Amino acid sequence: IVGILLPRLREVAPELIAREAVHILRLLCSIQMADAQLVKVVTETVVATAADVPLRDARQCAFILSETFPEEAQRILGAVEHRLCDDIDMNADANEVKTTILDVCRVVSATCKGPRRLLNSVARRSMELLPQLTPLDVAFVLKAFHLSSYRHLRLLRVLSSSLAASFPTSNVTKEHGLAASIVVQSLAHFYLSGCEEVVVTLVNASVNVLEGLNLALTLLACVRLRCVSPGVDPAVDALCSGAPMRRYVHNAHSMQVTSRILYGLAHAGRCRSDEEVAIVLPLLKSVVRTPGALRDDCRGFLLDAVTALGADGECSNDALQEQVRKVYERLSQDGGK
Amino acid sequence: GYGRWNQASVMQPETLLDLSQAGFYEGAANMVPKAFQ
Amino acid sequence: TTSRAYSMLLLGQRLSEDIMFDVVQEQSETIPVDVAAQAACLFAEKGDIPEGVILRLSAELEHISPQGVTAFVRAARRDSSGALLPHYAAVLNRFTERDLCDTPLETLLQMCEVFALPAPRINESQSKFQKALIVRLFSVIQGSRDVPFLCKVAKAVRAFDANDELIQFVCSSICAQGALSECEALIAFDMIRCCDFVYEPLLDAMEPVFRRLVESVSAMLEGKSTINDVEVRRCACFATLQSEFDCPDFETLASLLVHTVEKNVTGCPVELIPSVGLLCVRTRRTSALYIVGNKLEGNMQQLSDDAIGELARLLVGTENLATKELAVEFQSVVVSRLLRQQSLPPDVVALSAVVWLRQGDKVGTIDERSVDYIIKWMYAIGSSVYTDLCLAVHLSASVESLSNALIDDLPRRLELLTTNEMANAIFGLGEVSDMGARLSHQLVAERCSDYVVDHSQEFWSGKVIARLLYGFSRMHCTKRSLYNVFATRLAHRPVFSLLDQEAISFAIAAFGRVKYLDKKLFDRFTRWILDHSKDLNAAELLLTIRGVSRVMLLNDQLYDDLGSKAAEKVKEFPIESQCVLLSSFGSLGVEHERLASRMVSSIAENREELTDATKAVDVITSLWSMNYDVEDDKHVAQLADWVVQRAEELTDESIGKLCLVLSDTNWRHVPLVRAIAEQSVRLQGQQSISPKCCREVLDVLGTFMIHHQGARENLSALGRSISKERIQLSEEEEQHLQLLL
Amino acid sequence: DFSHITRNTVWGLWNEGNLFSLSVPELAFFLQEHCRVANVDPRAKKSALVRQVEEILSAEQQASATVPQEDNPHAIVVT
């Protein structure tokens, strides 16, 4: 029915209220049938009538097509940026401003780009709204500044301090696990100091519930924090001795995770102890037995890992060195040998 | 609600009512005079 | 002589009516082509370029000097008729080049600024020129080390020309130099704010210098207070720049500075406070109260020339911190500064004029010197200041020269401002120009009308459209094209369904003031105002009842609802509004007992404020037309007795209407009849009466059986000449009659 | 433009007071073919062309449609 009716859509498109274009686009995008011919018409209408249009509708329209067409969402957001900033500043009710900042942060994170003034206003508002901030709200607010390369040092430090390792019943399962990953990734992206205590308590409280693969990401952050923060080193030890890694040693859930773990473990120098050998050897054997050629990012990661291992003279285990050579020839065969 | 609502402008005497109508004459049915036998 | 005019125009000064006639001077050949180009530039602003100049520039074009190219592009960008768009393909930005590596860098800056002018409401040559200039600027600034030089070239390329790689290179180089003095740091802050760009290492290098400056200024307070003027000036400049840049990293310094200033306002230098107040406007700081003006009441005579600019920019901000004494002292200070040399830029003077005008009647009249200053250097005033002046000129009286000089540049200002500014300015000029209503205000208006109906597809806002229509309606400019086009552009589904208690009342009033009722559009308007009717503020029922009654629409439910709503709110309506609201219902013939009963009480109680008795008799007549008993409660009796007591200001029309009302209604009340007879006698005494009025007064006297021999005697010849039908007789019958009698 | 715009269509639009519901090329073609004008600058906006078309149509209209519903002497007729 939609396929038959669609050619008529492009004829009567520039006469639709935005409040019904929202549902039109929802229906067209929920079945993957939406084409890039009426979307531009609706975007043109919305950007033309941005002077007087409800902000909820503009936010919905910017969010809904953000996954597939980012540029149209960017233009829609830029059309009403100033009005949205004024609304988020002058408003009083906590619920509406909270929903607005959460939604705009989600849109900015999804589109991987964000205007400067809107981000500044969202920053100050998120500072004023500290009490009502749920852990997921803080996680998403901090995530928005990630994947956008925007620095708000005051915001980073204040939000890290206000996190205060306050978990639900101090036994949080996932409410601050992804939040933990976002925190470490953000603090690694914009290096700083003074967060050692918060970082170590968060790692201790999250490693028990970090069974997800995001732990690997955390490892990267940790080694990327080893350059300027030595006190993170015990936490990495905990991250190198957690039960989730003990379970993962038996079966590698993701081979990309295996490659990233190998890189982080090599850069951390964890190829000395017998436990480290008993961890690395299954991964190297799995990579050797991994069927087919490695993926582009994957083959780059193993190339970096083997280059570091060759530069790492601490590898004295002859079986481990022979396995490293086997990975070398496997990657060469992937590359032509 | 602005612009001296309490000072109504003097309305010119040379104003006669006018109407705008569209499609009154256009149409295939109303095209030409007809006849019958 | 055209060179002097060109230079004075580039200086931003206003033309005089003699200069255009002097520069015409038979603009034929035997002059350099650059002179023709500058004549075209001068004539572009004042209407369309004459055809002779166009043909002469298209024919004599052989080689063009760089100043000639600048004039050519300025004329192309400023012309609205597009007369330079042809022959612009002949010289596409001088595609033959020979300009770069052949002209001084200052000419390149002139190119950069002239390209920044907004385009009028086939282009790849522009891109070619832009990239060629980018390469040329890269080449020249690659081999020079002078901070202000690069700063000014960044100001030049601030227009959207590249992908911000040149500004990135400039920032990288200035950060790589590593020598950041306070003056260079301030100029770099100026460039980064003007370009609207963010760079991390530049901020990192900039922070310590500003931290040191803020620390020194904090120590500049009580204790170790060794007063230094340049330090305070630099701190004020930094605060002013941060007030608008709003850097995420330069925020602890500003917070510390304002915190230090707030709690220790004892003897701080006068130059600091305007800047810290401007900063307090940002970040929503209410602590600026009882600080600015509390100490700065009459000691603002010592402020520098720069300080007055930000003081004005602060005062034109939130009105809460603008007082009568502050405004008066500010006006005195600015006029004193105009009297001396080193005159302030016209922006400051214009803003001070706006501040004075906003006050209204609480102050007197602006000095003629300030008006003369505003009239001169007119084109140096920004669009926002123009909109502010046009909005504020109507709030005070005794302004006639400024308004006349204000609606003179609008035809040339059409393309230099957004649609919202167009609507606001047109509505703002709709209150004083209507008071003018001169013939000189016709042609201008006429021209504007045409423009509005040409590019009418760019208006996507209901409020803008309705306010523009109201502004054109309050100008005695009645047409058919404008209203016809804007009654259809407003009927679109996206354009509609965005109006709320405004742009409906304004549009209805603008339509009913010129009688261009549109049937279906008015039907939708009535349905909307019927759906949401209980929430219409006062001064809007008056604006819609007149508009819907002047187009002769006879609806029962709508008029019932509007009458009930108006009757509910009575104290808000002033006297003239009451009279007009009664006359609006009276004109059609609809009747409403509640409205009249509730509304005549106020006009009876406030009787003494009426201008004369003519308005009273008009109210009585309009009340009669509404099918309301005139022999009702003593309020009509009070009105009649007041008319009787002051029955000397009546005229022919009032007497005729009152006689008609009495004759129709059968009102026995004699003293007003005696007053009517006596006033008719007095009016006839000065031969300022009409025969119909005499006939009417004699008729009512005869019906009511009052003798009044004095009125009967002298009005007989006037009254009998209209009613007595006379047969035209020939001279022979006249002589036969003479024989008969 | 094309052949669909004719004298009857423009006359109907003129009598219903809706001439602005037409594009610039249509009006230019009508002026260049029906009204037989010398030449038109391909830059004029809607208002100038509409006014020119309207003046030309009104000037060349000489068939009176009103019928005098009144009595008047001095009129000589031999019918």
Residue type, C741: L
Instruction: Report d(CA C112, CA C169) in Å as an integer.
Output: 19
Spell out which residues of chain C touch residue A52, defining contact as CB-CB under 8 Å: 461-463, 498
3-state secondary structure of D9: helix
Instruction: Report d(CA C14, CA A280) in Å as an integer.
Output: 82
**Residue A39 C-alpha from the chain's centroid:** 28
Q: What per-residue string of b and e applies to C124-134 under the rule 16 or more CB within 10 Å gives b?
A: eeeeebbebbb
- For the record, the structure tokens of C23 come out as 């520069």
Is residue C167 within 8 Å of residue C157, measured between CB atoms?
A: yes
Is residue A305 within 8 Å of residue A263, measured between CB atoms?
A: yes
Instruction: Report d(CA B9, CA C474) in Å as an integer.
Output: 7
3-state secondary structure of C317: coil
Q: What per-residue string of b and e applies to C100-114 under the rule 16 or more CB within 10 Å gives b?
A: beebebebbbbbbeb
**CB atoms inside a 10 Å sphere around CB A41:** 15
Residue type, B35: A
Length of chain B: 37
Q: Do C513 and B9 touch (CB under 8 A)?
A: yes
Instruction: Report d(CA C533, CA C541) in Å as an integer.
Output: 10
**CB atoms inside a 10 Å sphere around CB A325:** 13
| Half-sphere exposure for A112 (CA within 13 Å, toward CB) | 6
C-alpha gyration radius of chain B: 22
CA angle (D64, D65, D66) in 5-degree steps? 100
Which among C316, C261, C335 has a CA at the least distance from the CA of C294?
C261
DSSP A269: T
* Cβ-based neighbours of C316, under 8 Å, separated by 6 or more: C351, C354, C355, C388
Rounded-to-5 percentages of helix, strand, coil across chain D: 40, 0, 60
Q: Nearest residue on chain D to C452, judged by CA atoms? A: D47
Long-range contacts of A315-324, Cβ-Cβ distance < 8 Å, separation of 24 or more: A315/A271, A317/A277, A319/A281, A320/A271, A320/A277, A320/A280, A320/A281, A320/A284, A323/A281, A323/A284, A323/A285, A323/A288, A324/A284
Spell out which residues of chain A touch residue C495, defining contact as CB-CB under 8 Å: 49
Q: What per-residue string of b and e applies to C379-404 under the rule 16 or more CB within 10 Å gives b?
A: bebeeebbbbbbbbbbbbeebeebbb
| Half-sphere exposure for C538 (CA within 13 Å, toward CB) | 14
Run of H or E including C512: helix C505-512
CA angle (C569, C572, C578) in 5-degree steps? 85
- Which chains have 3+ CB pairs within 8 A of C? A, B, D
Sign of CA dihedral C585, C586, C588, C593: positive
- C346-359 and C383-392 are packed helices; what angle lies between their axes, rounded to 10 degrees? 20
Q: How far is CA C479 from CA B16, C456, C620, in A?
A: 12, 16, 35
CA angle (A258, A259, A261) in 5-degree steps? 65
| Half-sphere exposure for D25 (CA within 13 Å, toward CB) | 4
Chains A and C touch each other (3 or more Cβ pairs < 8 A): yes
Q: Supply φ then ψ for residue A320, to 5 degrees.
A: -65, -40
Is residue C213 within 8 Å of residue C238, measured between CB atoms?
A: yes
Is residue C473 within 8 Å of residue C434, measured between CB atoms?
A: no
Sign of CA dihedral C154, C159, C161, C163: positive
Q: Nearest residue on chain D to C457, judged by CA atoms? A: D46
- For the record, the structure tokens of C175 come out as 């950060």
Instruction: Report d(CA C96, CA C90) in Å as an integer.
Output: 11
Q: What is the resolution of this structure in A?
A: 3.7
Residue type, C503: A
Question: Could you please report the per-residue DSSP string of C190-251?
Answer: HHHHHHT---HHHHHHHHHHHHHHHHHHHHTSSSS----HHHHHHHHHHHHHHHHH--SSTT
Q: Which of C54, C80, C454 to mutate to test binding with chain D, by most D CBs within 10 Å of its CB? A: C454
Distance (Å) from the alpha carbon of B28 to chain C's nearest alpha carbon: 23
CA angle (C534, C538, C542) in 5-degree steps? 105
Q: How far is CA C474 from CA B9, C226, C576, D5, in A?
A: 7, 61, 18, 38
- A94-111 and A135-145 are packed helices; what angle lies between their axes, rounded to 10 degrees? 40
Question: Could you please report the per-residue DSSP string of C138-203?
Answer: HHHHHT---HHHHHHHHHHTTSS-SSSHHHHHHHHHHHHH----HHHHHHHHHHHHHHT---HHHH
- For the record, the structure tokens of C579 come out as 């009279």
Is residue C402 within 8 Å of residue C393, measured between CB atoms?
A: yes
**3-state SS of C594-627?**
HHHHHHHHHHHHCHHHCCCHHHHHHHHHHHHHCC
Sign of CA dihedral D25, D31, D33, D39: negative
Distance (Å) from the alpha carbon of D24 to chain C's nearest alpha carbon: 11
Question: Could you please report the per-residue DSSP string of C533-577?
Answer: -TT--TTTHHHHHHHHHTTT---HHHHHHHHHHHHH--SSS-HHH
- Match 């009757």 to its residue by tokens: C567
Instruction: Report d(CA C499, CA A52) in Å as an integer.
Output: 9
Q: How far is CA C414 from CA A278, C107, C426, C462, in A?
A: 79, 28, 11, 20
Q: How far is CA C144 from CA A238, C106, C155, C175, C182, in A?
A: 56, 15, 17, 15, 21
Q: Supply φ then ψ for residue C249, to 5 degrees.
A: -105, -30
- For the record, the structure tokens of D3 come out as 């052949």
Q: How far is CA A38 from CA A35, A48, A60, A61, in A?
A: 7, 15, 17, 13
C-alpha gyration radius of chain D: 17
Instruction: Report d(CA D8, CA B28) in Å as an integer.
Output: 12
3-state secondary structure of C366: coil
Which among C280, C264, C325 has a CA at the least distance from the CA of C299?
C325
Instruction: Report d(CA C669, CA C194) in Å as an integer.
Output: 80
- For the record, the structure tokens of A116 come out as 């400067």
Q: What is the dihedral of CA C519, C524, C529, C531, to 10 degrees?
A: 140
- Match 């504007």 to its residue by tokens: C448
- C383-392 and C419-428 are packed helices; what angle lies between their axes, rounded to 10 degrees? 30
**Residue A199 C-alpha from the chain's centroid:** 18
Distance (Å) from the alpha carbon of B26 to chain C's nearest alpha carbon: 18
**CB atoms inside a 10 Å sphere around CB D78:** 3
Alpha helices in chain A (DSSP H): 2-12, 18-30, 39-48, 55-64, 70-79, 81-90, 94-111, 116-128, 135-145, 153-163, 177-189, 196-207, 214-225, 233-239, 243-250, 255-267, 274-289, 296-311, 318-334
Could you tell me the end-to-end alpha-carbon distance of chain C, in angstroms, rounded to an integer? Answer: 90
**Residue A275 C-alpha from the chain's centroid:** 31
Instruction: Report d(CA C221, CA C264) in Å as an integer.
Output: 8
**CB atoms inside a 10 Å sphere around CB C413:** 18
Instruction: Report d(CA C287, CA C283) in Å as an integer.
Output: 11
3-state secondary structure of D10: helix
- Which chains have 3+ CB pairs within 8 A of A? C
Q: How far is CA A141 from CA A134, A168, C177, in A?
A: 11, 19, 37
- For the record, the structure tokens of C39 come out as 């004549």
Length of chain A: 337
Instruction: Report d(CA A219, CA A240) in Å as an integer.
Output: 9
Residue type, A82: H
- C670-685 and C652-665 are packed helices; what angle lies between their axes, rounded to 10 degrees? 150
- Match 């004109």 to its residue by tokens: C587
- For the record, the structure tokens of C415 come out as 């393309």
Residue type, C479: K
Q: Do D17 and B21 touch (CB under 8 A)?
A: yes
Sign of CA dihedral C281, C282, C284, C286: negative
Is residue A155 within 8 Å of residue A119, measured between CB atoms?
A: no
Spell out which residues of chain B touch residue C550, defining contact as CB-CB under 8 Å: 11
Q: How far is CA C43 from CA C50, C335, C575, in A?
A: 8, 33, 51
Residue type, A16: L
Q: What is the dihedral of CA C90, C93, C99, C104, to 10 degrees?
A: 140
- For the record, the structure tokens of A242 come out as 């957690």
Q: Nearest residue on chain C to A155, judged by CA atoms? A: C248
Instruction: Report d(CA C477, CA C445) in Å as an integer.
Output: 7
Is residue C423 within 8 Å of residue C464, measured between CB atoms?
A: yes
Chain pair B-C, CB pairs under 8 angstroms: 55
Q: Does C435 touch chain B (CB under 8 A)?
A: no
Alpha helices in A130-194 (DSSP H): 135-145, 153-163, 177-189
Which among C617, C579, C569 has a CA at the least distance from the CA of C600?
C579
Instruction: Report d(CA C659, CA A92) in Å as an integer.
Output: 63
Q: Does B9 touch chain C (CB under 8 A)?
A: yes
Spell out which residues of chain B touch residue D6, defining contact as CB-CB under 8 Å: none
Is residue A159 within 8 Å of residue A142, measured between CB atoms?
A: yes
* Cβ-based neighbours of D2, under 8 Å, separated by 6 or more: none
Sign of CA dihedral C185, C189, C191, C195: positive
- For the record, the structure tokens of A306 come out as 């083997």
Instruction: Report d(CA A143, CA A104) in Å as an integer.
Output: 12
Distance (Å) from the alpha carbon of B8 to chain D's nearest alpha carbon: 30
- Match 């409906």 to its residue by tokens: C504
Alpha helices in chain D (DSSP H): 7-15, 24-33, 46-59
Q: Do C480 and D47 touch (CB under 8 A)?
A: no
Spell out which residues of chain D touch residue B22, defining contact as CB-CB under 8 Å: 16, 18, 21
Q: Do B26 and D16 touch (CB under 8 A)?
A: yes
Q: Do A17 and C492 touch (CB under 8 A)?
A: no
Residue type, C118: P
- Match 């900033």 to its residue by tokens: A85
Instruction: Report d(CA A140, CA A144) in Å as an integer.
Output: 6
Q: Do A52 and C498 touch (CB under 8 A)?
A: yes
- Which residue in the set C198, C200, C493 is minimally distant from A116, CB to CB? C198
Is residue C25 within 8 Å of residue C43, measured between CB atoms?
A: no
Instruction: Report d(CA C280, CA A298) in Å as an integer.
Output: 54
Burial of C615 (0-12, 13-18, 19+ CB in 10 A): middle
- A2-12 and A18-30 are packed helices; what angle lies between their axes, rounded to 10 degrees? 150
C-alpha gyration radius of chain A: 24
3-state secondary structure of C275: helix
Phi-psi group of D75: left, alpha or beta (phi > 0 → left; psi -120 to 50 → alpha; rest → beta): beta
- Match 């970090």 to its residue by tokens: A210
Q: Do B12 and C431 touch (CB under 8 A)?
A: no
- Match 């015990």 to its residue by tokens: A234
Is residue C621 within 8 Å of residue C594, measured between CB atoms?
A: no
Chains A and D touch each other (3 or more Cβ pairs < 8 A): no
Instruction: Report d(CA C342, CA C364) in Å as an integer.
Output: 27
Q: Does C460 touch chain A (CB under 8 A)?
A: yes
Residue type, A97: V
Instruction: Report d(CA C414, CA C197) in Å as an integer.
Output: 31
**CB atoms inside a 10 Å sphere around CB A73:** 23
Is residue C154 within 8 Å of residue C191, measured between CB atoms?
A: yes
- Match 């200053």 to its residue by tokens: C373
Instruction: Report d(CA C597, CA C477) in Å as an integer.
Output: 38
Instruction: Report d(CA B14, CA C32) in Å as an integer.
Output: 53
Chain pair A-C, CB pairs under 8 angstroms: 45
Residue type, C452: V
- For the record, the structure tokens of C660 come out as 């008609």
Which among A56, A46, A148 has a CA at the least distance from the CA of A99?
A56
- For the record, the structure tokens of D66 come out as 């009103």
Is residue C27 within 8 Å of residue C56, measured between CB atoms?
A: yes
Instruction: Report d(CA C527, CA C531) in Å as an integer.
Output: 6
